[PDB]
A paper describes a structure:
Prokaryotic cell envelopes often include proteinaceous surface (S-) layers composed of self-assembling subunits in porous two-dimensional crystalline lattices. S-layer anchoring is best characterized for Gram-positive bacteria, where S-layer proteins non-covalently attach to the PG layer via species- and strain-specific non-classical secondary cell wall polymers (SCWPs). SpaA possesses three consecutive SLH domains near its N-terminus, followed by a large C-terminal region presumed to harbor the self-assembling domain(s). The crystal structures and binding analyses presented here of P. alvei SpaASLH, SpaASLH/G109A, and SpaASLH/G46A/G109A with synthetic SCWP fragments provide novel insights into the functional contributions of many conserved SLH domain residues, including SLH-Trp13, SLH-Gly29, and SLH-Arg43, which precisely interlock from three different SLH domains to generate two active binding sites.
We investigated the effect of this flexibility on potential ligand binding in G1 by solving additional co-crystal structures in different space groups (P1 and C2), where further unique conformations of residues 44–54 were observed. To further investigate the activity of these two potential binding sites, we performed isothermal titration calorimetry (ITC) analysis of SpaASLH binding to 4,6-Pyr-β-d-ManNAcOMe in solution, which revealed 1:1 binding with an apparent dissociation constant (KD) of 29 nM. This 1:1 binding in solution likely occurs in G2, because this site is occupied in all five crystallographically unique molecules and has better complementarity with ligand than does G1, which was only occupied in one of five molecules. The pyruvate moiety of the ligand is bound deep in the pocket through salt bridge interactions to Arg61 and Lys130 and hydrogen bonds to Gln108 and Gly109 backbone amides, while the hydrophobic face of the ManNAc ring stacks against Trp151. Upon binding in G2 of wt SpaASLH, the phi angle of Gly109 (SLH-Gly29) and the psi angle of Gln108 (SLH-28) each flip by ~180°. The backbone carbonyl of Gln108, which hydrogen bonds to Arg61 (the conserved SLH-Arg43) when unliganded, is resultantly replaced in space by the Gly109 backbone amide nitrogen, which forms a hydrogen bond to a pyruvyl carboxyl of ligand. Concurrently, the removal of the hydrogen bond between Gln108 and Arg61 allows Arg61 to make a bidentate interaction with a pyruvyl carboxyl and O6 of ligand.
Residue numbers in the entry: 28 to 192
The structure:
């Protein structure tokens, strides 16, 4: 039975998570941008990086943005679609929330969102969050609307990896 730190060490060794510049501290209580999380998903699920394609209109989303290949992969894969379809905003600097992460992993794992789910999640996410809870990706007392901590993301990613095996 591994601690959150040991799960992190393992995922980092596997190249799925990385740390912070200048320090080996894993900063498990810190948050994560949607950009960095896209990359996590790409490494976690072995997705192919997509260069030279730009499907969003966010400021500074272009060839100079290191995250675009990962964001494009998770979008082609159907894991993430962004926050606004008519304006094509992904919001890559905003932080990944528990309910957002829940959707991505539930989808990757082909678990079915719970229609009729009763919980504190935003409307669009209720079923994804319930499915993620039921599958043990996040604790039931996690706050679906909060920014996910890196600890929570390490636990969720580690559990998801084990379910793909
Ligand atoms: C605010 O709208 C939500 O935005 C969420 C952003 O996070 C993810 C995981 C994403 O697809 O990128 O999920 C999004 C939700 O589907 C939802 N987006 C829309 C367009 O309805």
């Amino acid at each position: 039975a591994k601690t959150t730190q040991e799960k992190f060490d393992a995922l980092k060794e596997a190249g799925v998570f990385s740390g912070y510049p200048g320090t080996t501290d894993a900063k498990l209580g810190q948050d994560m941008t949607r950009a960095e999380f896209a990359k996590v998903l790409v490494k976690l699920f072995g997705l192919k990086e997509i260069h030279g394609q730009y499907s969003y209109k966010d400021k500074n989303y272009d060839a100079k943005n290191w995250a675009a290949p990962f964001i494009e992969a998770v979008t082609a894969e159907g894991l993430m679609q962004g926050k606004d379809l008519t304006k094509k905003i992904f919001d890559f600097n905003g932080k990944i929330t528990v309910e957002e992460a829940s959707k991505t992993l539930v989808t990757a794992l082909k678990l079915e969102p719970v229609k009729d789910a009763q919980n504190k999640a935003t409307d669009w996410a209720k079923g994804y969050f319930e499915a993620a809870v039921n599958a043990g990706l996040f604790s039931k007392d996690a706050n679906p609307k909060a920014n996910a901590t890196r600890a929570q993301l390490v636990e969720a990613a580690f559990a998801a990896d084990e379910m793909s095996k």
